[PDB]
């Protein structure tokens, strides 16, 4: 229990409703390595995700890339949910297309 995770959600391309895209979630700067990460669609877990290998940076904190192929729309709300020893409850960060 040292460093708590940063969570950043973003897309590969500018969101255009009804067009194919990729939603990325980058979890970084956490320690120790034990972590749980999920991409969310309207609150529900996305099963067809892909992730990268656990890695770390010069300062020894760990990072992880999650991503899934998706199509944005007016209605659908996408998010990234993380759980870690440094958190008292899983943290959720919402994809904001205009941010």
């Amino acid at each position: 229990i040292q460093r708590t995770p940063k969570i950043q959600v973003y897309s590969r391309h500018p969101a255009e409703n009804g067009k194919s895209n990729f939603l990325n979630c980058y979890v970084s700067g956490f320690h120790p390595s034990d972590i749980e990460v999920d991409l969310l669609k309207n609150g529900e877990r996305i099963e067809k995700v892909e992730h990268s290998d656990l890695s770390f940076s010069k300062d020894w904190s760990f990072y992880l890339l999650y991503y899934t192929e998706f199509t944005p729309t007016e209605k659908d709300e996408y998010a990234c949910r993380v759980n870690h020893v440094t958190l008292s409850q899983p943290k959720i960060v919402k994809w904001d297309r205009d941010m």
């Binding site: 973003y10 590969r12 990729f22 120790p32 020894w60 205009d98 941010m99």
Partner: protein
């Protein structure tokens, strides 16, 4: 620019009985190798990943790593018991080298405990980092007794690695040297006001990593531009967001400017409207 070989290892000891060891290799910013513990094999991630090495040569490295992984593991648990170190343990190792065109070759072998540096292989032996608590010094004394391991590590670093990397560079140069032009878009962020605007600039899909993104009024950089972290895409290109917290009236005439090596001097300029 430079394309160092970074060999990463993540060994997690939860208790005396449960441990997990995984590794990867990065050449420059490209991940070339994967080593899972649910596999007694080192997976190559690019067709040029094996460099100029035979399968005989390569297949031995396969076996030498397994012996390493287990030796390291029991050695750690043993240090833990001697030095009364409490579980769980987070050991990390960052080792490799980088080849210089075309004379010398520098190398490095760093190990961290619980996310903090403790020791490294400097010259023909192990040295503790200056901060290191004193138990690390006892560990150094033990480690430095093993002249066999020393010479081995020194050989890998000063000999094998450089030789290996040179191969990788020859075979993968084309992919390393590639340039990928980014695309940029504008958007309105969460109101810092009212009555304010958060001007957000998106730059995504660029390679390699070094980029330049600033909000501008003509040729005047906006001291106030706040760039975010450079984030990775699944396709080995990056993503960067730059914001400006401004009075709504200021937005008019403001532009977002992207400078990247792939653009060949032709900056991307997006105007706020």
């Amino acid at each position: 620019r430079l394309f160092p070989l970074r060999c990463l290892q993540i060994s997690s000891f939860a208790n005396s009985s449960w441990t997990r060891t995984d590794g990867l290799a990065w050449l420059g910013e490209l991940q070339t190798h994967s080593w899972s513990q649910d596999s007694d094999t080192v997976r190559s991630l690019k067709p040029w990943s094996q460099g100029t090495f035979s399968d005989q040569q390569w297949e031995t490295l396969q076996h030498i790593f397994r012996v390493y992984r287990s030796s390291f593991t029991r050695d750690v648990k043993e240090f833990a018991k001697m030095l009364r170190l409490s579980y769980p343990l987070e050991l990390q190792v960052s080792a490799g080298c980088e080849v210089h065109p075309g004379q010398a070759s520098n190398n490095f072998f760093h190990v961290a405990f619980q996310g903090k540096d403790i020791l490294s292989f400097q010259g023909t032996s192990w040295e503790p980092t200056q901060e290191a608590p004193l138990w690390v010094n006892l560990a150094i004394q033990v480690l430095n007794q093993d002249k066999w391991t020393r010479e081995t590590v020194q050989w890998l670093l000063q000999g094998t690695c450089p030789q290996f990397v040179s191969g990788l560079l020859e075979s993968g140069k084309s992919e390393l040297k590639k340039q990928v032009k980014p695309k940029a878009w504008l958007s309105r962020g969460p109101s810092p006001g009212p009555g304010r605007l958060l001007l957000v600039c998106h730059v995504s899909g660029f390679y390699p990593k070094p980029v330049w993104v600033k909000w501008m009024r003509g040729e005047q950089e906006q001291q106030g531009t706040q760039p975010g972290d450079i984030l990775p895409n699944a396709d080995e290109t990056w993503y960067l967001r730059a914001t400006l917290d401004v009075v709504a009236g200021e937005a008019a005439g403001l532009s977002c400017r992207v400078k990247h090596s792939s653009l060949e001097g032709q900056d991307i300029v997006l105007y706020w409207h």
